């Protein structure tokens, strides 16, 4: 497990994005870029030869499921494993995002120690 997977950060919000710059460079993991919104990570997906997304839902560009979805339906994208951040904690909200093929799921507010117990498991 890579402290060196080039990982994209998802957010409408910088100072969310940053909290996770960090709390992923506690962690060991600096190779990090962020985009705010999904309208704007996909073409930075789309070519940017990232391993591994954090990205939040409420985002007004292109909600959070949805970039979801189309990194499932690229075919060069779809391996790609996905750790969504959330807003929202409703069990109907988390169905519809397994559903969609997310690798695991966090509820804000969070600490690098939640952080890391999600991260051990989804590379698994
Ligand atoms: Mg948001």
Redesign the pocket.
């Known amino acids: 497990a890579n402290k060196n997977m080039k990982i994209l950060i998802v ?3 910088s100072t ?1 994005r940053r909290i996770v710059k960090n709390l992923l460079r506690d962690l060991g993991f600096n190779n990090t870029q962020e985009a705010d919104d999904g309208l704007t990570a996909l073409p930075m997906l789309k070519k940017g030869d990232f391993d591994f997304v954090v990205t ?4 007004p560009g292109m909600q959070g499921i949805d970039l979801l979805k189309n990194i499932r339906a690229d075919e060069e994208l779809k391996h790609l494993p996905v750790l969504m951040i959330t ?1 929202e904690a409703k069990r109907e909200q988390i169905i519809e995002a397994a559903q969609a093929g997310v690798n695991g799921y966090i509820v804000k507010p969070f600490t690098a120690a939640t952080l890391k117990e999600k991260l051990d498991k989804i590379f698994e």
């Open positions: 957010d409408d919000f969310m939040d839902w409420n985002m807003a």
